[PDB]
Amino acid sequence: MKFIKYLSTAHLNYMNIAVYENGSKIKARVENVVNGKSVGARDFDSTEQLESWFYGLPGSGLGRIENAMNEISRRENP
Amino acid sequence: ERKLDPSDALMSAGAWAQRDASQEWPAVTVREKSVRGTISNRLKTKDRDPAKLDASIQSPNLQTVDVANLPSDADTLKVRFTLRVLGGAGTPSACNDAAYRDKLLQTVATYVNDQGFAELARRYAHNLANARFLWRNRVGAEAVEVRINHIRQGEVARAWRFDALAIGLRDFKADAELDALAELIASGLSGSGHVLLEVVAFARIGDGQEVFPSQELILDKGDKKGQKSKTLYSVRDAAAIHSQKIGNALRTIDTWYPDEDGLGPIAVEPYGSVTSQGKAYRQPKQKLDFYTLLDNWVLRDEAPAVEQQHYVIANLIRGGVFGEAE
Amino acid sequence: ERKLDPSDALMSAGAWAQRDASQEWPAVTVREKSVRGTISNRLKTKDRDPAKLDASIQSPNLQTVDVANLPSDADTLKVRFTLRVLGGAGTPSACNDAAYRDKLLQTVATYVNDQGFAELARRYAHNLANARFLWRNRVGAEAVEVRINHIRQGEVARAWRFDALAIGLRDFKADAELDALAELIASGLSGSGHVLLEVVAFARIGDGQEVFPSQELILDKGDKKGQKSKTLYSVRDAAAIHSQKIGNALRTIDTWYPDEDGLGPIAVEPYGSVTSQGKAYRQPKQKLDFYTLLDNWVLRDEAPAVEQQHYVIANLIRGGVFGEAE
Amino acid sequence: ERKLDPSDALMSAGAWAQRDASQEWPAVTVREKSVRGTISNRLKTKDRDPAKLDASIQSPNLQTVDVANLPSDADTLKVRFTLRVLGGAGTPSACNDAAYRDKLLQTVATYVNDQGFAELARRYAHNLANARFLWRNRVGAEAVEVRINHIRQGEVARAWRFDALAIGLRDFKADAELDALAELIASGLSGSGHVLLEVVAFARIGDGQEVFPSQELILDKGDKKGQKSKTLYSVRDAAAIHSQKIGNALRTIDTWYPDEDGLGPIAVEPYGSVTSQGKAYRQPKQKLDFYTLLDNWVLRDEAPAVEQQHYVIANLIRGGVFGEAE
Amino acid sequence: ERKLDPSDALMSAGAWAQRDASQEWPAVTVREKSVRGTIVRFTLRVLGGAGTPSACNDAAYRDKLLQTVATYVNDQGFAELARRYAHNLANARFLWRNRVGAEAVEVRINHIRQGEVARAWRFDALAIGLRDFKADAELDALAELIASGLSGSGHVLLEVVAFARIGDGQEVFPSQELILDKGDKKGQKSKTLYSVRDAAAIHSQKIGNALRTIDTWYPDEDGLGPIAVEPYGSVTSQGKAYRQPKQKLDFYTLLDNWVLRDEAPAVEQQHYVIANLIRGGVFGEAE
RNA sequence: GAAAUUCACGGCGGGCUUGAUGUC
């Protein structure tokens, strides 16, 4: 549903943040680069939030993808 | 009369031990005492994407960015050592007696029947060629499963001891043996007649084996793996966990027992293609096939529903009894 | 009829070994016995800021402070020794036989088909020029990947042994060879005809290689690295982990196998620019490009969807079969 | 058309080696074979508090206690030897060819453009005075950075070998040279024309250097240091870790490469004050200044945003190309 | 305008070397070639020995770091003020006339038989700068007018202000007594008292010898300043930032006084008034 | 009370940590 770009070379798990927008919110469905089986996502405000907390998590480079994935994956948002 | 059991169990006689990957050099073959064991080092890989995609309804900008990137996960890679060319396999499997002596008895009369059948297929039918399946189609080292591909010289020294003292002693060459058929070999009959001295309650036999692939230098292996069920959240980086002994490289008993369960050429469909593992419902985990389906009457859950009241299997008994040697 | 497999697997024949960085001097070249191995020394750096700043909504005061500041860190970067000018590369890759002999069989009839295709591209099509890709575009030592830049003299002695006894013996000069094209060389045909004696089940061949860059003194290298996934919390100081053998400097097998997978000039777009690594979906990890995209019909996941029922590839077979030499 | 790369990389051609602090005596200068190397001793010091206080909101009783006390610490600090007056510097830097030959190609057409620019600033513009920056403003041994202060006689013998055999041979006196300007010297043009024979792909050149400060007796040095990030908890006593080679005293490559990167008098503001290190954004780590700020159009991240479409730099090209000699 | 630096550094010009404890006999004084080094004194050797070749560096305020280059130009202007305007006759006469009296040989100075100080100097291997002294014939609370002391201090005038490269190979000889002990330089027991726990005073060694390290030695030629706030002739303290002697745990020039080295350019860099306490505000920058 | 989870896949490219001090 209205697919957009990734977050910076994401697997190491055959997994990704896989950002793709909703009509009002934005879905960042942490999912497979294979079959399409996903784990839980998170819907929120725009790229001006997305990069802002995505930058805001610890880790160096690939660590931001990593702690990002464990952050989305223990989700609050249904 | 003599209805089937609501609860049956049979002990896995002729069970097996673990493997001891440790590395040595050929013509230093006989000096297996301090053969240095190998540990699953962790390498740290990057990748491309060789996987197919569902191609039904997808945005193309998915896959164009999918194939492009790095899926870079770290992989625990067991590696050989630097100058040691032999492998090493200390696998002391031991045979247990009393082939149909159950663990549970929902009806003791049914147990007495099945023991009568054990005297039928034990006193009436013999285990020369049964143990010649367990040797002549296991000394050819399907034992060393994935590492069998292009051995330099697969030396199989299936030794045996009373005690600390080792007396049962014989030498082989698994590369000098077939892996689709069994052939008449005298020393193979020494080992298989020795297992005849094992299974049917004559002498306690635990076969300390020394199997040596003399293959090559520092190459990888195909050693036994683990799982990622409820361990891929705290790790998420290793995705292939090799199971370890104490500072060593396992080949676990669970792959190893279908090296000495892959016998039965009494499969329904094939002829000489498939030396499958003789099991209940005869399923090989690779091909996802069911030799002896429900529709055939060749089920291990029907061989006593036929034999326990009707006595007719006629030499498919062997793959209906080695269903109960597990 | 003969639908595609839900489960396929093919064994990586012609696999490779690890690398042995150890340092020597030229004209002491032949005396490679006690060539002293190299260990990853650790540096520490003060990082400047070459990273291009974002220009969406940012400020020109932050770059002042940050470019003034130092985000320093340490890097485990390996150094040559003091007076040793040669490098050293003991890489004994070994070839496995039976190029399409699968590991899994979702349909055995499909396996019989693919083996028939293996007899087609093996008995019908030959592997003279295939092995001349694997030599004439790998003896030119793309092998020694990042260190190839301005070698003094890259000596490639691809040796081979029956046993401990070494008989397969030939000498080269990778600097005397092209790295965008392959040329006709007689001894290159000795080695590639030797790999013809390897791949198609004739003789077990594991090529103990001795590759020597005679480059310079105490300079750095480009040796194989690791990752910082769930190791950058307890460390946070090293940010480039070089993987080690036992007291040595690896160049791992994972970069090394695309030194002998970078063959195919059967790419869709380019002509002589790109000697890419022949893979499923043909993705090079550097350029993030997808030669043989989905939109082209040049997919390795479509070459048996075409060839297994339709028999038409016509000499792009070679980069559709070396997709299955992995 | 021809948009900028989302991923660029350029290999550090003309890279450098490590340093070899080892001590000798002048007029025993030529006999550098067994020149004994130096090991950074651990001085252990007690000190005052020269650090200024924060002066915002502080009770005055604290600092009386503070300056009254001793915050003593160990500090690993190297000492010269007893009777050896020369220093010693074996630094064999080697030049790599193909100055703009990239490592990554987000657009191969952009790569072809930049290679065209490399033929422009290489065939069109010459590297006589570029290499005369790299010699005439580096033979004056900014090389030996902190030890240059009051050398008795700084002898610079930038030697060079084909092989083990040394042929490139020339002698200097860095104290007989300026360190704010470059002057016309014939042998300096022999070395810089030799680097002209290096950089632009003519001959593989790794310059085994012998630089000798004949300074004084047992004095200290300014040798290369380390860090205290996640090592100051288990130690907390040493607070200045000198990095070591194998039983020796490093001056690491990271300070050393801005001895042969401090060239550019093409800085925006100054005239002859500042011989800064030509970098992306042109930041010197000492003064925390940003010559070529964002507000000026003199950015290395704007010189191809201007030159790749607009072709106008006009001899500030040199400090926009030696941005890509790293 | 011209705010203070967030990052300052100044190189320790006029630095020093290590010491060479090796033992000799008086009237065999001149034959210092094979004077046997010590690892207690030796049995029959009565002289000590001190080869300490300190060397002077030039360009007294030439910084290492420049948080503002204009501030650096200011401070260099001040260096021309206290260098061209103010002279270093009596500054170097502190560094000789209150260091030739061998506070150099610190703890061993107690009851020397005859402390001979031969502060030699060489161009090269060739030694030309040559002068002889007697530190016991000199005061250690005051400085007196001596002609050869002005030869050495005028020689350091030829050193510090960029005229000639001078590294003074010294030969200082205490002719004291026989096999007695010393007060040689020590070490520490931080994270070495667990594996040892038996030695509790580690003397630092040169190669088979007895150090007196540079860290005690540089406050033999930093103990100058009689420009201390409180005392008069009692205390020849070591001129430092905040002027703290490590013995007495005192802070001459406390924060409450305006005599701080971290306030002498906060005053002088904008206000130009120190008036001959400059000397102990500049030798704060000769370190 | 007894089950083979697999085969396999490039991670990299650069970097002035430095400036000076009393062992109780």
PDB file of N, CA and C in Angstrom, chain D residues 135-183:
ATOM      1  N   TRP D 135      56.796  16.535  -2.057  1.00  0.00           N
ATOM      2  CA  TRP D 135      58.186  16.412  -1.659  1.00  0.00           C
ATOM      3  C   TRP D 135      58.690  17.707  -1.041  1.00  0.00           C
ATOM      4  N   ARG D 136      58.663  18.801  -1.806  1.00  0.00           N
ATOM      5  CA  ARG D 136      59.187  20.098  -1.375  1.00  0.00           C
ATOM      6  C   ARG D 136      58.451  20.686  -0.184  1.00  0.00           C
ATOM      7  N   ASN D 137      57.276  20.163   0.142  1.00  0.00           N
ATOM      8  CA  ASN D 137      56.602  20.477   1.389  1.00  0.00           C
ATOM      9  C   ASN D 137      56.315  19.211   2.200  1.00  0.00           C
ATOM     10  N   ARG D 138      57.093  18.150   1.966  1.00  0.00           N
ATOM     11  CA  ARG D 138      57.141  17.015   2.868  1.00  0.00           C
ATOM     12  C   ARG D 138      58.535  16.450   3.089  1.00  0.00           C
ATOM     13  N   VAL D 139      59.521  16.765   2.246  1.00  0.00           N
ATOM     14  CA  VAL D 139      60.898  16.380   2.557  1.00  0.00           C
ATOM     15  C   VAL D 139      61.401  17.197   3.733  1.00  0.00           C
ATOM     16  N   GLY D 140      61.034  18.478   3.769  1.00  0.00           N
ATOM     17  CA  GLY D 140      61.048  19.233   4.999  1.00  0.00           C
ATOM     18  C   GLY D 140      60.153  18.463   5.932  1.00  0.00           C
ATOM     19  N   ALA D 141      60.780  17.767   6.875  1.00  0.00           N
ATOM     20  CA  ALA D 141      60.143  16.648   7.541  1.00  0.00           C
ATOM     21  C   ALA D 141      59.095  17.107   8.529  1.00  0.00           C
ATOM     22  N   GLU D 142      57.973  17.607   8.013  1.00  0.00           N
ATOM     23  CA  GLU D 142      56.748  17.584   8.789  1.00  0.00           C
ATOM     24  C   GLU D 142      56.340  16.165   9.118  1.00  0.00           C
ATOM     25  N   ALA D 143      56.801  15.195   8.323  1.00  0.00           N
ATOM     26  CA  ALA D 143      56.938  13.786   8.661  1.00  0.00           C
ATOM     27  C   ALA D 143      57.186  13.515  10.140  1.00  0.00           C
ATOM     28  N   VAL D 144      58.329  13.953  10.653  1.00  0.00           N
ATOM     29  CA  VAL D 144      58.664  13.694  12.046  1.00  0.00           C
ATOM     30  C   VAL D 144      58.071  14.851  12.843  1.00  0.00           C
ATOM     31  N   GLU D 145      56.797  14.725  13.231  1.00  0.00           N
ATOM     32  CA  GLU D 145      55.981  15.897  13.536  1.00  0.00           C
ATOM     33  C   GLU D 145      56.448  16.677  14.754  1.00  0.00           C
ATOM     34  N   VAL D 146      56.325  16.097  15.935  1.00  0.00           N
ATOM     35  CA  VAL D 146      56.550  16.876  17.139  1.00  0.00           C
ATOM     36  C   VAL D 146      58.035  16.897  17.466  1.00  0.00           C
ATOM     37  N   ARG D 147      58.787  15.974  16.902  1.00  0.00           N
ATOM     38  CA  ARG D 147      60.204  15.896  17.172  1.00  0.00           C
ATOM     39  C   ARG D 147      61.007  16.878  16.318  1.00  0.00           C
ATOM     40  N   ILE D 148      60.358  17.570  15.375  1.00  0.00           N
ATOM     41  CA  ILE D 148      61.050  18.511  14.495  1.00  0.00           C
ATOM     42  C   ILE D 148      61.545  19.739  15.260  1.00  0.00           C
ATOM     43  N   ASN D 149      61.050  19.969  16.473  1.00  0.00           N
ATOM     44  CA  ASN D 149      61.416  21.158  17.227  1.00  0.00           C
ATOM     45  C   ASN D 149      62.860  21.052  17.674  1.00  0.00           C
ATOM     46  N   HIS D 150      63.702  21.880  17.053  1.00  0.00           N
ATOM     47  CA  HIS D 150      65.128  22.015  17.336  1.00  0.00           C
ATOM     48  C   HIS D 150      65.852  20.678  17.166  1.00  0.00           C
ATOM     49  N   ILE D 151      65.815  20.219  15.944  1.00  0.00           N
ATOM     50  CA  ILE D 151      66.672  19.126  15.531  1.00  0.00           C
ATOM     51  C   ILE D 151      68.095  19.651  15.485  1.00  0.00           C
ATOM     52  N   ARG D 152      69.062  18.812  15.849  1.00  0.00           N
ATOM     53  CA  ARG D 152      70.446  19.160  15.556  1.00  0.00           C
ATOM     54  C   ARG D 152      70.706  19.122  14.054  1.00  0.00           C
ATOM     55  N   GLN D 153      70.350  18.018  13.397  1.00  0.00           N
ATOM     56  CA  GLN D 153      70.477  17.918  11.942  1.00  0.00           C
ATOM     57  C   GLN D 153      69.503  16.862  11.445  1.00  0.00           C
ATOM     58  N   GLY D 154      68.435  17.292  10.782  1.00  0.00           N
ATOM     59  CA  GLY D 154      67.442  16.351  10.312  1.00  0.00           C
ATOM     60  C   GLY D 154      67.781  15.801   8.946  1.00  0.00           C
ATOM     61  N   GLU D 155      68.405  14.628   8.918  1.00  0.00           N
ATOM     62  CA  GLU D 155      68.837  13.998   7.678  1.00  0.00           C
ATOM     63  C   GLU D 155      67.717  13.128   7.123  1.00  0.00           C
ATOM     64  N   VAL D 156      67.359  13.365   5.870  1.00  0.00           N
ATOM     65  CA  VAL D 156      66.250  12.694   5.214  1.00  0.00           C
ATOM     66  C   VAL D 156      66.813  11.954   4.011  1.00  0.00           C
ATOM     67  N   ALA D 157      66.844  10.628   4.084  1.00  0.00           N
ATOM     68  CA  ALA D 157      67.359   9.796   3.000  1.00  0.00           C
ATOM     69  C   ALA D 157      66.198   8.965   2.463  1.00  0.00           C
ATOM     70  N   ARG D 158      65.450   9.546   1.536  1.00  0.00           N
ATOM     71  CA  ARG D 158      64.269   8.908   0.963  1.00  0.00           C
ATOM     72  C   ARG D 158      64.732   7.904  -0.081  1.00  0.00           C
ATOM     73  N   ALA D 159      64.978   6.680   0.365  1.00  0.00           N
ATOM     74  CA  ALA D 159      65.476   5.651  -0.528  1.00  0.00           C
ATOM     75  C   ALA D 159      64.328   4.903  -1.202  1.00  0.00           C
ATOM     76  N   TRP D 160      64.673   4.163  -2.252  1.00  0.00           N
ATOM     77  CA  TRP D 160      63.681   3.397  -2.989  1.00  0.00           C
ATOM     78  C   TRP D 160      64.326   2.187  -3.643  1.00  0.00           C
ATOM     79  N   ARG D 161      63.571   1.093  -3.680  1.00  0.00           N
ATOM     80  CA  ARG D 161      64.016  -0.169  -4.227  1.00  0.00           C
ATOM     81  C   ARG D 161      63.052  -0.685  -5.289  1.00  0.00           C
ATOM     82  N   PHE D 162      63.605  -1.263  -6.364  1.00  0.00           N
ATOM     83  CA  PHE D 162      62.821  -2.143  -7.229  1.00  0.00           C
ATOM     84  C   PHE D 162      62.243  -3.295  -6.434  1.00  0.00           C
ATOM     85  N   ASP D 163      63.089  -3.912  -5.628  1.00  0.00           N
ATOM     86  CA  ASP D 163      62.999  -5.276  -5.142  1.00  0.00           C
ATOM     87  C   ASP D 163      63.657  -5.244  -3.781  1.00  0.00           C
ATOM     88  N   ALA D 164      64.295  -6.333  -3.370  1.00  0.00           N
ATOM     89  CA  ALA D 164      65.335  -6.195  -2.354  1.00  0.00           C
ATOM     90  C   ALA D 164      66.410  -5.191  -2.780  1.00  0.00           C
ATOM     91  N   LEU D 165      66.725  -5.135  -4.079  1.00  0.00           N
ATOM     92  CA  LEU D 165      67.729  -4.215  -4.601  1.00  0.00           C
ATOM     93  C   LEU D 165      67.231  -2.776  -4.588  1.00  0.00           C
ATOM     94  N   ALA D 166      67.990  -1.905  -3.928  1.00  0.00           N
ATOM     95  CA  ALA D 166      67.655  -0.497  -3.782  1.00  0.00           C
ATOM     96  C   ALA D 166      68.391   0.323  -4.826  1.00  0.00           C
ATOM     97  N   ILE D 167      67.638   1.101  -5.603  1.00  0.00           N
ATOM     98  CA  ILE D 167      68.191   1.921  -6.674  1.00  0.00           C
ATOM     99  C   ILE D 167      67.799   3.386  -6.516  1.00  0.00           C
ATOM    100  N   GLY D 168      66.521   3.650  -6.250  1.00  0.00           N
ATOM    101  CA  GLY D 168      66.081   5.004  -5.975  1.00  0.00           C
ATOM    102  C   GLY D 168      66.724   5.514  -4.705  1.00  0.00           C
ATOM    103  N   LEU D 169      67.682   6.427  -4.848  1.00  0.00           N
ATOM    104  CA  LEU D 169      68.533   6.836  -3.737  1.00  0.00           C
ATOM    105  C   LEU D 169      68.803   8.325  -3.840  1.00  0.00           C
ATOM    106  N   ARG D 170      68.520   9.055  -2.761  1.00  0.00           N
ATOM    107  CA  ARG D 170      68.774  10.486  -2.693  1.00  0.00           C
ATOM    108  C   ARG D 170      68.810  10.934  -1.239  1.00  0.00           C
ATOM    109  N   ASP D 171      69.605  11.973  -0.985  1.00  0.00           N
ATOM    110  CA  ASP D 171      69.923  12.468   0.347  1.00  0.00           C
ATOM    111  C   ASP D 171      69.428  13.902   0.499  1.00  0.00           C
ATOM    112  N   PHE D 172      69.077  14.290   1.726  1.00  0.00           N
ATOM    113  CA  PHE D 172      68.530  15.619   1.967  1.00  0.00           C
ATOM    114  C   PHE D 172      68.971  16.139   3.326  1.00  0.00           C
ATOM    115  N   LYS D 173      68.454  17.322   3.660  1.00  0.00           N
ATOM    116  CA  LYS D 173      68.604  17.925   4.981  1.00  0.00           C
ATOM    117  C   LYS D 173      67.350  18.760   5.193  1.00  0.00           C
ATOM    118  N   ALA D 174      66.413  18.232   5.984  1.00  0.00           N
ATOM    119  CA  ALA D 174      65.128  18.896   6.166  1.00  0.00           C
ATOM    120  C   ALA D 174      65.271  20.209   6.917  1.00  0.00           C
ATOM    121  N   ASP D 175      66.299  20.325   7.757  1.00  0.00           N
ATOM    122  CA  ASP D 175      66.593  21.595   8.398  1.00  0.00           C
ATOM    123  C   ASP D 175      67.102  22.629   7.409  1.00  0.00           C
ATOM    124  N   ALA D 176      67.671  22.194   6.284  1.00  0.00           N
ATOM    125  CA  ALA D 176      68.068  23.091   5.211  1.00  0.00           C
ATOM    126  C   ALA D 176      66.919  23.415   4.266  1.00  0.00           C
ATOM    127  N   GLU D 177      65.677  23.260   4.719  1.00  0.00           N
ATOM    128  CA  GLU D 177      64.498  23.488   3.903  1.00  0.00           C
ATOM    129  C   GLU D 177      63.465  24.261   4.707  1.00  0.00           C
ATOM    130  N   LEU D 178      62.634  25.010   3.987  1.00  0.00           N
ATOM    131  CA  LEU D 178      61.571  25.795   4.591  1.00  0.00           C
ATOM    132  C   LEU D 178      60.410  24.893   4.997  1.00  0.00           C
ATOM    133  N   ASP D 179      59.583  25.392   5.912  1.00  0.00           N
ATOM    134  CA  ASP D 179      58.359  24.702   6.289  1.00  0.00           C
ATOM    135  C   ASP D 179      57.143  25.604   6.192  1.00  0.00           C
ATOM    136  N   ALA D 180      57.261  26.732   5.502  1.00  0.00           N
ATOM    137  CA  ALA D 180      56.107  27.506   5.088  1.00  0.00           C
ATOM    138  C   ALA D 180      56.048  27.726   3.588  1.00  0.00           C
ATOM    139  N   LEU D 181      57.135  27.470   2.863  1.00  0.00           N
ATOM    140  CA  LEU D 181      57.177  27.644   1.420  1.00  0.00           C
ATOM    141  C   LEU D 181      57.946  26.496   0.792  1.00  0.00           C
ATOM    142  N   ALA D 182      57.809  26.370  -0.522  1.00  0.00           N
ATOM    143  CA  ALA D 182      58.529  25.376  -1.308  1.00  0.00           C
ATOM    144  C   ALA D 182      59.494  26.098  -2.235  1.00  0.00           C
ATOM    145  N   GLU D 183      60.721  25.600  -2.324  1.00  0.00           N
ATOM    146  CA  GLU D 183      61.733  26.196  -3.180  1.00  0.00           C
ATOM    147  C   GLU D 183      62.219  25.213  -4.233  1.00  0.00           C
TER     148      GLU D 183
END
